[PDB]
């Protein structure tokens, strides 16, 4: 996969997040690299920067000896018997070839990922295991982790990337893998994968490896990308909005039946309808009020795991009654 081949392995390949690398480079020259708490939206590059700094400061051979990676599996016995032990293991002796190139600090690195849904007792033990003997723990909701941990660890908000700095790197990928793409496809992959970036890379990889089966060598057109991510195409959405713009109950019911039967079985049509009805400039304010309210109501209904056919039919009938 391309996500691991072109994973940022050093501190300068990252281009989306810039506010977080400068301060770590500033702290680099001192042995006072403290405990730290990374948080933000998924697919931002957090683990990439963590692995990059560990590789830059510790060396390739020692990666598995003193740099440890732990995740969210199923306990307290793990902390009291292994994680504390892993914290108090006598660090291995970095050989001369390591000192030749890498300045070694006098402490170990233990990476606990997904610190969000952890139990408070494990945290009360983990603060003690880290204070008496460094750590880089990660979560996506800072509210759930207890305060005694965040007291000694300095916080870093890994901001979600914007549409501006995300293109060039993606463009770089299009040059690095000899993938032939269409003209207006990159920003489409960006907006369908808005916020997160690794999903865009997986989408590009899937689209390339799928189009290559056809043997055409043709530009990967946008409909392939829109079909891969499961979003409803623009033609079917145009048909829906045209049918609902002026139509009786029977025609809307029959068309939504055909849609739920053979059409795109995703419930993302409400998102496309919201985007189209809000970003448009043809409907007045009193219309958009009820449009937004009905869309919110239908989304709150669909969020409860109910049936999508009835909710979609109700939403279409209500948006037609206006």
């Amino acid at each position: 996969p391309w996500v691991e081949k072109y994973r940022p392995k050093n501190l300068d390949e990252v281009t989306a997040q810039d506010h977080a690398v400068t301060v770590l480079k500033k702290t680099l020259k001192s042995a006072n690299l403290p405990h730290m708490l990374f948080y933000g939206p998924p697919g931002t590059g957090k683990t990439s920067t963590i692995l990059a700094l560990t590789k830059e400061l510790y060396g390739p051979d020692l990666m598995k000896s003193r740099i440890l990676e732990l995740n969210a599996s199923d306990g307290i016995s793990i902390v009291r018997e292994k994680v504390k032990n892993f914290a108090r293991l006598t660090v291995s002796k970095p050989s001369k070839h390591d000192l030749e190139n890498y300045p070694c600090p006098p402490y170990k690195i233990i990476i606990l990922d997904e610190a969000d849904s952890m139990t408070a007792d494990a945290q009360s033990a983990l603060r003690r295991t880290m204070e008496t003997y460094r750590f880089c723990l990660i979560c996506n909701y800072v509210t759930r982790i207890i305060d005694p941990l965040a007291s000694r660890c300095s916080k870093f908000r890994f901001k979600a990337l914007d549409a501006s700095n995300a293109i060039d790197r993606l463009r770089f990928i299009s040059e690095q893998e000899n993938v032939k793409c269409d003209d207006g496809v990159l920003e489409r992959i960006l907006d369908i994968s808005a916020g997160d970036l690794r999903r865009g890379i997986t989408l590009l990889q899937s689209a390339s490896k799928g189009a290559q089966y056809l043997g055409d060598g043709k530009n990967i057109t946008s409909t392939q990308v829109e079909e891969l991510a499961g979003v409803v195409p623009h033609d079917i959405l145009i048909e829906i909005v045209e049918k609902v713009k002026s139509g009786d109950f029977d025609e809307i019911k029959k068309y939504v039946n055909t849609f739920m039967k053979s059409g795109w079985s995703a419930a993302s049509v409400v998102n496309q309808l919201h985007e189209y009805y809000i970003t448009n400039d043809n409907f007045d304010t009193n219309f958009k009020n009820q449009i937004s309210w009905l869309l919110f109501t239908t989304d709150s209904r669909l969020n409860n795991g109910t049936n999508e056919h009835i909710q979609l039919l109700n939403l279409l009938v209500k948006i037609s009654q206006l």
């Binding site: 899937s206 991510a229 109950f249 795991g305 109910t306 009835i310 109700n314």
Partner: protein
């Protein structure tokens, strides 16, 4: 009958040439087979496509399969012994027999199966009945074991699926079969079983009455072939299952009579339908979509019925006693009409 003529290989599928082409293209790279997420309406033939892709990548020995039992230890002292239908090269998990042990049993069984030894397939039937904890554990296993486990998740209307799952697998949709292809696949069956068809319109009629449901169309054709002495003529009284007739009679009673003296019988019929292994959401959906087809109603009544049904569907998905919400919906319907 219906299981008799079922494709056991990619060459044997006579529907949706595009998907068969994509599947035979995927089956040419056994070393790299990404995780798959199949979605689409019921009765479309996605499990058949799973077991046919497995037949094409592996040997024909995938279809011989046996059921085993494996034991795990939960949080409490109730050590669970759960069944699993497996094959020499794959296994199937249906997380509907258990309700809350999902996030534990999924991760534990997957981590045990990853370490028994070139990979093994795990088909998660009904991948929409997994709570967010179960899906989180599933994505954890997907991140951990990528060299020996290849998940092929079968589901329908994949809205209740967390985004890290969607990102880490290839999404595939299986549209319902058009009436034309249903006609051909039914002609194949009536030819192989020497059925005396009077005309070819009965096939299109069954296809239209099945609402794009392939297996329901086949089952209805078989059920109606055992009533006319295997001689299906133009006078074909299309037979519905034993429960749809009761729902249609209840709809006719609701439309014809609007009073509490009829509401008592409606509650009795709802009891009789619910006690006999029929869910609540299916009853509500069927009653709603049968109350909208009546000709005696106008647009306002239908627009109110659909709203009441949309509200009571959430109320059914939020409560534990279904007869309460069903009777409330019927009462509101009778109040509107």
């Amino acid at each position: 009958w219906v299981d008799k003529y079922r494709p056991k290989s990619l060459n044997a599928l006579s529907h949706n040439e595009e998907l068969t082409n994509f599947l035979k293209s995927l089956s040419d790279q056994p070393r790299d087979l990404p995780h798959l997420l199949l979605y689409g309406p019921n009765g479309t033939g996605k499990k058949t496509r799973c077991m046919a892709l497995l037949e094409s990548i592996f040997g024909p020995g995938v279809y011989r399969l046996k059921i085993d039992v494996r034991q795990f230890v939960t949080a409490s002292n109730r050590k669970l012994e759960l069944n699993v239908v497996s094959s020499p090269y794959h296994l199937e998990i249906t997380p509907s027999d258990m309700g809350n042990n999902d996030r534990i049993v999924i991760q534990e069984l997957l981590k045990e199966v990853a370490q028994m030894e070139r990979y093994k397939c795990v088909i998660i039937n009904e991948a929409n009945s997994l709570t967010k904890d179960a899906q989180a554990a599933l994505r954890r296993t997907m991140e951990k074991y990528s060299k020996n486990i290849r998940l092929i998740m079968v589901c329908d209307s994949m809205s209740p699926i967390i985004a890290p799952i969607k990102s880490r697998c290839l999404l595939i949709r299986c549209p319902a079969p058009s009436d034309s292809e249903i006609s051909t696949i039914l002609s194949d069956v009536v030819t192989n079983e020497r059925i005396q068809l009077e005309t070819k319109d009965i096939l299109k009629r069954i296809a239209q009455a099945s609402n794009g449901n392939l297996r329901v169309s086949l089952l209805m054709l078989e059920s109606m072939a055992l009533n006319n002495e295997l001689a299906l003529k133009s006078s074909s009284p299309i037979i519905k299952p034993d429960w749809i007739i009761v729902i249609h009679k209840l709809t006719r009673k609701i439309v014809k009579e609007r009073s509490v003296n009829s509401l008592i019988e409606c509650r009795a019929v709802l009891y009789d339908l619910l006690a006999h292994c029929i869910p609540a959401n299916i009853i509500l959906k069927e009653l709603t979509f049968s109350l909208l087809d009546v000709e005696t109603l106008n647009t306002t009544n239908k627009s109110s019925i659909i709203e009441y049904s949309s509200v009571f569907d959430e109320r059914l998905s939020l409560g534990n006693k279904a007869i309460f919400h069903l009777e409330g919906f019927i009462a509101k319907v009778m109040c509107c009409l």
